[PDB]
From Swiss-Prot, chain D:
It comes from the Viruses. This is Capsid protein VP2. It is found in: Virion; Host cytoplasm. Interacts with capsid protein VP1 and capsid protein VP3 in the mature capsid. Forms an icosahedral capsid of pseudo T=3 symmetry with capsid proteins VP1 and VP3. The capsid is 300 Angstroms in diameter, composed of 60 copies of each capsid protein and enclosing the viral positive strand RNA genome. The chain holds residues 75 to 341 of 2209 of the full protein.
Amino acid sequence: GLPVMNTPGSNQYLTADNFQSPCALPEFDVTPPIDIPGEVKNMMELAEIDTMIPFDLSATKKNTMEMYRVRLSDKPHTDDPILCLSLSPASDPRLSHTMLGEILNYYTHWAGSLKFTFLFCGSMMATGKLLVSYAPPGADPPKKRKEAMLGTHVIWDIGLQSSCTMVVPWISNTTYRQTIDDSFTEGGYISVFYQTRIVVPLSTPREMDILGFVSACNDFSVRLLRDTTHIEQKA
Amino acid sequence: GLPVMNTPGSNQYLTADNFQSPCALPEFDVTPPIDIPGEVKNMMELAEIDTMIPFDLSATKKNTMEMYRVRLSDKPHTDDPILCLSLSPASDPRLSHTMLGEILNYYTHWAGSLKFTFLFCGSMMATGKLLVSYAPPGADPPKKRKEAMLGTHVIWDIGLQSSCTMVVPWISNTTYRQTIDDSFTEGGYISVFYQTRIVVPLSTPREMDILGFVSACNDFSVRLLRDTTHIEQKA
Amino acid sequence: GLPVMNTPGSNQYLTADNFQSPCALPEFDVTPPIDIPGEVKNMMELAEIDTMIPFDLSATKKNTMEMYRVRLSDKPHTDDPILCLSLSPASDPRLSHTMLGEILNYYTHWAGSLKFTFLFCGSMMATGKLLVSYAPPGADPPKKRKEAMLGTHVIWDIGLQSSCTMVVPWISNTTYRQTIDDSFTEGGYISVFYQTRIVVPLSTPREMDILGFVSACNDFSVRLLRDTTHIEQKA
Amino acid sequence: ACGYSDRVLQLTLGNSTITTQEAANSVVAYGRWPEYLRDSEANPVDQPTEPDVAACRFYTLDTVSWTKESRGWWWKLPDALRDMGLFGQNMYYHYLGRSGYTVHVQCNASKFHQGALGVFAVPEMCLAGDSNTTTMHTSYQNANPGEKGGTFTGTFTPDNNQTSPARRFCPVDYLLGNGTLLGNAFVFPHQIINLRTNNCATLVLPYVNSLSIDSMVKHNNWGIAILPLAPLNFASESSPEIPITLTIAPMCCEFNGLRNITLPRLQ
Amino acid sequence: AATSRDALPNTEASGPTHSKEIPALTAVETGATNPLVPSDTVQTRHVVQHRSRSESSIESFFARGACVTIMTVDNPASTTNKDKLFAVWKITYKDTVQLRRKLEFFTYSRFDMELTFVVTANFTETNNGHALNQVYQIMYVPPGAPVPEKWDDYTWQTSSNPSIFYTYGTAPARISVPYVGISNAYSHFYDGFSKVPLKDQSAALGDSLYGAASLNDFGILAVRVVNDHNPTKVTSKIRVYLKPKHIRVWCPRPPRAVAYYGPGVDYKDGTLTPLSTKDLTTY
Amino acid sequence: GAQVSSQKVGAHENSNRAYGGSTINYTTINYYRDSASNAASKQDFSQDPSKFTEPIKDVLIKTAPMLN
Amino acid sequence: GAQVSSQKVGAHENSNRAYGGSTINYTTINYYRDSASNAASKQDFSQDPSKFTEPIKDVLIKTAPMLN
Amino acid sequence: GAQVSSQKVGAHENSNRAYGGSTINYTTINYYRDSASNAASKQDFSQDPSKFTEPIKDVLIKTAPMLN
């Protein structure tokens, strides 16, 4: 009956293949699903939830609480960066672990605008203005307020509304960027400077710390799944 | 003709598989079925027929008639259990063989309410009130009428209507319970005590026996078939 | 193209299998069939044609003409059988070769009513009454007219109409009987006795012979084909 | 309304009439009640004979004494009757015999006795023999006890005689004789006569068998097996004894293919 | 309309009571079992029961295909002094405990036997030899047909004997068989003899074993090694798996309690003790 | 002569239709002329356990007294 | 150009349709251009055994006397 | 009982239909009676990340001041 012909690619198993296969337990009455609070329909949903960036990764402060507290002081106004960061929501050790940056390793191409949210964690009295800035790639990274200022910045203010968010608009030469430290698909440069200085009244803690959070925006998306370098199975 | 492709899982025999297969005796005129009295359409039907529980399993009384007769006496009212039983209509040696408990081994998950029926088998004169009780798991098994009383009980009465039935309502944390003595999916505890005492008039047998029966209710059902431990084929 | 899966039972040849297979001589102009006198559409048709039973199988008379002539005499009325026969239109050496009994070996189950036809082959003058009888199984075979008489008999008469036929009604505990000498599916017992005696006038051959024929009735049918023991291929 | 309370009945099959007064509303095998062979499922082609009243009536077999050491009794119906009036004579005269039944197990005590007799009607009750050497070798003469019936035993005893054996069944009671637990036996059509309450059990058994109509002399159908569930006790007395007595009635029976009389070696 | 994959009657709600209605009290003499629902001995809520008996149905209980028998056969060197081994097994489930207990819960049964064959094979002797992919013949020899004498005899010509030629190493062979019973259900338990003894005969001439019905109900399987005597002797084993497909069962008999012994219900001593110990007053 | 029937899906996500709505079917085709060769259609029924549980020469009302 | 026909099922449980009602069919498709390659359709007939059983230059009534 | 659906082609040349117009479909057929055997239909949905991003006992307007 019916003359058929086995085609190049027969008897071939393909891990990510999708073909119907005989059922081991025929008839097994499956248990009805309840309505568990908190479903998730797509990974990029998780990508839109802020996760604190471990900004400091100094041999001493790494792998320990001190790693997320970016300390600011009441030092006389300077023009040097109080944090840097290579926009590589996958590559840069600073982002490589945050939910966003942790999901980004299970992929080969990320895209869309990101949103860094900074929380001033210090004495209700302390005030000041911090300039959070981004400058697309291909130019000397910014090391002075004078140079960073020229790029895309949001001159934030430490007040009642305790937090800010500088959206990093998706400005890139390709439709997606390599989720590996590739030179052609470079990310850009993020960097917060003091626009004034954190001024405090007498009898106040002179060294308050800021915590940074990061997340994707309803634009972001990833593609071509892979195995995260993050966890190894020794032997 | 027709270019096809053998898919992962070809030339694979699967015992419980259901595929059409060539007929060995082509045309063989099958003999017409008659209407034999007593058909059965589903195993759980048998599960709803009482089968006497062999309550006593003492080295002396086991594997012999005496094993189903649970003797009661005209002893002065006490507060100790005149039988126990771990609700495990599969695991507990006391139930492991009854039709219900015998069908329960051919499965990996049982569910639904059970119904224990006790028959007072003794002198028409003898009277008394026995408290049959059940207490869901996770608490010290009941060893005194005072403690068992608190759970789900049916304070039965030895009269004209010679038998009773205490339904054990399906109260459980999962949709089905392991048909193996698993701790997480524990059954509960059944236990009949004297609510008064079996009182008898003169010239009466002072030691009558009660027979217990057990069966499922139109709620019970089982799933994921296996091989009963009950019968072994040595060599 | 089209993802398929080879199922348990592939590349398996099954003698009695029925599958379409490529044609060796493509286009060969087949020769038109004529209307040959005498077609046959179903074996059981042949089963309904009488074939003479070789009733006598004595070392001397077997495998030779004398084997089909059942001789009767003008002996003074007796109550002993002038032939016997185990209803096993397959097993009993007496029937095992007749068309009916010859087709019955190519099968595992026969059924339906049979019809034994006896022809008085002797002098137009000779008269007499012979009692042809059948008695369903499970009882001492009949050895006296007195015992056989009780069963199903047709007290036949030697006259103008030279032949008779005693239908053996299909009386059996199963829907078909084993076409092998099986005890459970026993046939029954056939046996012709003299109801009077064959009386002849002077100058007549005092020893005439009767020939018996056997055939199925539009009720008979067989099933589950096999290889007849009847013909062997030595080396 | 009136005293038509379940406790009283009045069976009348044939010209006999049972009228019990502690009657536990009777059992009808499997809902299905006894009836004649519908042409739609008939098999043998002759005219089936039907004794009707001649056979259908109630036949009391012989009574069994019931003590403390009593371990149970067992009958093989098709056979159990073989003598009992015409159902006895018709029994043998035909190669085929389809017969339904109505077993009424009679046994009453005083309000002062105690015990429960589980009356189990097992279809195709194949009891096990007693030769650890060869299996099924049980002799006919011995395999069909008739009006007298056999009796369950305490513990198994292997038949050693082998120059020539005793060829009998050695039916153990906790295993319902057929190597299967008694406590689970409550699956067959049954009634427990529990001395306190009812003083009889009535089960109406419709002919059950893989065939339309089958043999009788050979193949058996239903088999009754009465076992003491609750042992009998009465007063601080050495041993008490009540007499259990069954009365069976063959209903809607028919037999095919008349012959000469069958005379089995029952001795 | 009430199929096997429905959903058990949903549990109805129920409050206090004090009625002359007496659900809880039975009386087992009637043999009838009180169909008391949880809703009777306790106050129940209104549960919308989803669970269904779709898997315990008579059809699904016997949904897996059990191993009815194993069959050893071997092709030795031509020079073998011994005759070439071709096994012959008599079709009858009663060889292994498993499928035999499942079927045994019921008194009668009507099923369509769907026989599959997982054939395997290794080189017997230490000798280091080779063997071109063997092909086996699995001839069904119907009840009463002539059972094969030598390995290579005429009986194997198979002009009318349903046979299968399995090539080693390939999708395991399968042949469906319809209810081949003489009666209207295979009787898992036959009470009575195949020959009644009659007084006007010798105790022998008319005797027989209890429980035995037809000499060859189901039939016999002849399985040879089709190739010729090859220098490297190769033994093979053909495990037959029978799975009752279109099935029906009647009269629910209590399951086998003590280890099986022979084709007949009979039981050996020792194995006579089935249950386990437990104190009449310990959970 | 297709034999299309509905499967009993447990309303699983992206299975074709569930808690977003929709049904699931499967095609079948008897291929052999001999019935005893068809795939066990698993669309089996379920009778009431009464011919075994509740078998009496009368009728039994549960709220009523057993032995009347 | 499907050749759908009815099988002769023995009203088996859950076979598709029986003593609950229903019929059973099976698809066939001749695949080769040469007829002598089609599957033996097994839907064969049955004539009356008369051209062999009852062949006479007249007519035979059974209740009548054979040799008139 | 064919399950024909539309693929999401990237308007590729000579793929059947694109920047010349046209659509692309693919046939599917559930073959096994047991649902847990069907091919993962990949036609999955997407909810709003709100039950995780924006979960508050009130409502949040973006242009508004957070901590009112």
